Design a protein around this ligand. Sequence first.
Ligand SMILES: COc1cccc(OC)c1-c1cc(C(=O)N[C@@H](CC(C)C)C(=O)O)nn1-c1ccnc2cc(Cl)ccc12
Length: 450
Amino acid sequence: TDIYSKVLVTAIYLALFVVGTVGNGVTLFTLARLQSRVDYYLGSLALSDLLILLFALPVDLYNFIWVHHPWAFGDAGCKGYYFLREACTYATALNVVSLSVELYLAICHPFKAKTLMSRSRTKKFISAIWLASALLAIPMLFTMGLQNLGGLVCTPIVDTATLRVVIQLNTFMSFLFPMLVASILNTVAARRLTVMVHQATIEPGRVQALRRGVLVLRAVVIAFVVCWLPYHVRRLMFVYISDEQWTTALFDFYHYFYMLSNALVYVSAAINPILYNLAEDLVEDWEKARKLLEAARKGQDDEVRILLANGADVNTADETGFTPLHLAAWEGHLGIVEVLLKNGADVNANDERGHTPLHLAAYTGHLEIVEVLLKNGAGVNATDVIGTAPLHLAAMWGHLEIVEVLLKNGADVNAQDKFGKTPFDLAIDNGNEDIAEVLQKAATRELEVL
Ligand SMILES: COc1cccc(OC)c1-c1cc(C(=O)N[C@@H](CC(C)C)C(=O)O)nn1-c1ccnc2cc(Cl)ccc12
């Protein structure tokens, strides 16, 4: 009797329909063309959420919101509707949990993630989820059916006791237990993730990727719970409210509660593509980073420029804490080092061992890179865990030209390490007598000031 309510809902239903159908459609079309196991889950969700908007929404809108009396889809359409709706609630829920499980494993079992996780395994698993959802939905073919009360309505055809149990079961199996598992695992994953963040002078890329996964998956569960709790609460209310005590106050309440509860289920399907965006955006950033470290190590000068331009993180590191700049200098790719520092690479970055790019540049003995790094404000007197300054390494491996370069930029010749050895001492040890003379005079000059 409140027509505005129905009209307002129609607008929102159509809005969620037209966009949500197109959104999930495009997501499936896009995916059709290592971590391609993510895509399978996002494809699984897209499919489940598409089917709800395409088949469930329009039937719901027509024969539950507007036209109450005559059921326009017959006995098959009645049974099918409730089957395909329940199948898709299960699939979506089970997929969302599988997602939080895969993240949890990736975080809390890195060793297992490498071995256990495989494309073939995921394909077989997703097939089981859909099949599990389909089997658990069969009861809806027998529990729901047409009744005449012209007066043809898609109402339960079993006794309330039976109906209360099948739905009570579905609510546990396709929400409560799923969300329980998910929420817990995500919290355990969040607790475990903060351990690995505490290890940080490294800043690993894989950690940063997982860090984001937790944030995305936190949103997915909070989003799923708020969207699906009202729906499940209403269906539980309906089974226990099946007595003919329907006061006009209860009618009014349920009328709006039905509209709102179902609208949020369609919202949950219409936001599904946003998750795809958040996932692909996260995975692409992770992929760009790996490629940047690979290209920097490899020396693919052309690739580096591309990656940086598209938005690859210049200050990424591997498990050990080596940034692309670190590797570029180590492999002696002057052209790359110049590009990285141009795009804003951290000149004073350290690995686990405490080695700045300048350490590795001195070790190898690439004069041109050293001069570049120092121009960009490198730490001349930067020491590692052993206590080795770059001059120590330059002197030890006999790079007299680098030794002169460093001292020019204000290198401390008097610096010592854990073994107490100065660069001059390391030159004498290694037998770089020519370099030692340069350091010998350097120390004597400083004494003259005092
Ligand atoms: C058009 O719907 C009916 C027509 C005649 C009799 C009816 O109830 C016996 C129903 C019916 C069914 C439902 C309902 O919520 N059904 C559940 C069934 C499940 C518990 C299995 C669902 O689809 O989630 N709700 N529901 C409704 C009853 C009364 N007012 C309603 C107002 C609206 Cl806007 C929607 C459904 C209503």
